[PDB]
Structure formats: C-alpha cells, structure tokens
C-alpha cells in the first residue's frame, strides 16, 4: 500500500513513505556499524506506528550525536524493527525520530 511494513508480519504497517527524511548528510538511509560490527542500513522517519519501546534511552554508541536511542520492536510479532531516537537537548530539530533497519521492512528498499 502506501506504507512500509514489518517484514515478519508482512502486513503490520510501521511508517509511510511521506515520513522519510534526511537527517544525516549521508542521506535518509545510510549504513551504520554497531559496536559488534553489525551493519544496519537505517532509514530515518519522523513518525512510526505499531512499535513497542524496550528499556531506557541510551546515548552510548549513538549514530546521531545529541540523540539517545531506544530499541523498538513490532508490537504484533516482537521482531526488531529499529530504534527510537530522542533529543537530549531542547533546541534540537527534530526532537525525536525513528531509525528503521532495512532488513526488517517490506517492501525491500
């Protein structure tokens, strides 16, 4: 449809293409390496739906300086979808966004 969905669910809608934006100058979906070497092509979107947040936000290893991250999973199947990023300072724009990992989404980008 209009939306990007949880690949495991196939049909649980997570965001819409209208929510994609460029935060990093590398673009709206760039490759990021986590502290264990795993590469996440991370699509940045303003808003997301049907996600559960796991745990407390953390700034350790954050790919977006000034933002903390919280693991986000599909609320229907519990598959990892990405992370919610929340600003640590009130003057930052946007104050929050979501980074969705490419392999967790359908259709295949």
């Amino acid at each position: 449809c209009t939306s990007l969905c949880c690949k495991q669910c196939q049909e649980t809608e997570i965001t819409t293409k209208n929510e994609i934006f460029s935060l990093s100058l590398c673009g709206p979906m760039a490759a990021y390496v986590n502290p264990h070497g795993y590469v996440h092509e991370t699509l940045t979107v303003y808003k997301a739906s049907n996600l559960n947040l796991i745990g407390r936000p953390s700034t350790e290893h954050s790919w977006f300086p000034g933002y903390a991250w919280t693991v986000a999973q599909c609320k229907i199947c519990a598959s990892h979808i990405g992370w919610k990023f929340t600003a640590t300072k009130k003057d930052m724009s946007p104050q929050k966004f979501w980074g969705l990992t490419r392999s967790a989404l359908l259709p295949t980008i």
Partner: peptide, 24 residues
C-alpha cells in the same frame, strides 16, 4: 546485563538473550 550484539536489546537472563538473538 546481557545484551544482544545485533540490536542492543538488554536482558536480565542469558536464556532470553539466546532465544532473542537467534530470532534475528
């Protein structure tokens, strides 16, 4: 105390981490 190397999800028990990790 136990952390998924793929996504950063934290777990109190090693057994939940293992089930979670192999779901990736």
């Amino acid at each position: 105390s136990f952390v998924c190397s793929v996504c950063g999800h934290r777990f109190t028990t090693k057994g939940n981490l293992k089930v979670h990790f192999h779901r990736h």
